[PDB]
Design a protein around this ligand. Sequence first.
Ligand SMILES: O=C1Nc2ccccc2/C1=C1/Nc2ccccc2/C1=N\OCC[C@@H](O)CO
Length: 291
Amino acid sequence: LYFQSMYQLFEELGKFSVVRRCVKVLAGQEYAAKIINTKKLSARDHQKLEREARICRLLKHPNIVRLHDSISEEGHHYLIFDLVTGGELFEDIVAREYYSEADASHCIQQILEAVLHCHQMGVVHRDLKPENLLLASKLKGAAVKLADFGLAIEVEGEQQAWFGFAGTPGYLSPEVLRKDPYGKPVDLWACGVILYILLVGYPPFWDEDQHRLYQQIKAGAYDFPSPEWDTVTPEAKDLINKMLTINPSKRITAAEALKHPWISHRSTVASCMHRQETVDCLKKFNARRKL
Ligand SMILES: O=C1Nc2ccccc2/C1=C1/Nc2ccccc2/C1=N\OCC[C@@H](O)CO
C-alpha cells in the first residue's frame, strides 16, 4: 500500500533479493530499491534486516553507496539507495582500450578506503566480490562504489568471534572455512582475491569440486605462473602475498595496505604496461559469473 504510494519501480539492475531502478515520483528523483521478500525469511533474517538498515545508515564515504530510506510493507522490505549508473567495474574494465597495473592499483586503493571506513565503524562486509564493485557513473574517472551489505556484521573493537558460515565460495577466507573465530581480516583476504583477478583476469583458487576448492584456500595454494605473471611488478605480488596470508593475525590490514608502495606510490611503482590478456581473460571470467 505505502511504498507503491511514493516510488515507481522500473527495470531490474540485479539480484537473496532484487534491485530495481525506482523514481520517487513527486520528488522526480531516481534511486535503486533493494527489494527483499520477507516470507522467505526467518525470525533471525528479519532481525538481520534491521541490522543491515542500521549498518548502511552509518556508512558515509564516497566509495560506498548511501542509504536514503527503509520501508517495510505486507510481504516486502525496501532499502532505497543512491543510484549508481556505471555498472560493474569488471564489466567496464573489459570495454577499455587500455588497462594496466596502475588502473588495478587505483581501483584497489578506492576499495581499501571503503573497507577502512567500514572497519573504523566496526563493520565487516564478509562477502566482498566483483558483484559489489559498481561504478558511480558512465563518465570517465567515475568512482568505484561498494554496494550491498546484506551479509555485513557489526564487530566489537578487534574481537574475533564465530559469526557463522557466510560468504561466496571463491572469496571465502581460511579462518571461516576452518570454523575459527574471525573478524576484519576476512575482508582483506577477499581483496587479495579481487587484486589477483584484476591483474590477470582469472581467480587464484578454482576447482569444480567445492571441497577441493576449500582445501586449496585453506592451504594457501595459489601461484603466479609464467608467462603472464612475468610482467607483473614484484610489489603487486608482494601485496597479494600479504593479503592472501593464511594466518589472519599476520595478514595485512586495510590501514597497512593503503600505505603499501604499490598503492601509496602507485605513480612510481605500479606498471603502466597494457595487459591485453587480462582484458580478454576477464571477459571470460565475467561470462562464467553470469551463466
Ligand atoms: O545503483 C545501485 N545502487 C545499489 C545499491 C545496492 C545494491 C545495488 C545497487 C545499484 C546498482 N546499480 C546498477 C547499475 C547497473 C547495473 C547494476 C547495478 C546495481 N546493482 O547490481 C546488483 C549487484 C548487487 O545486488 C550484488 O550484491
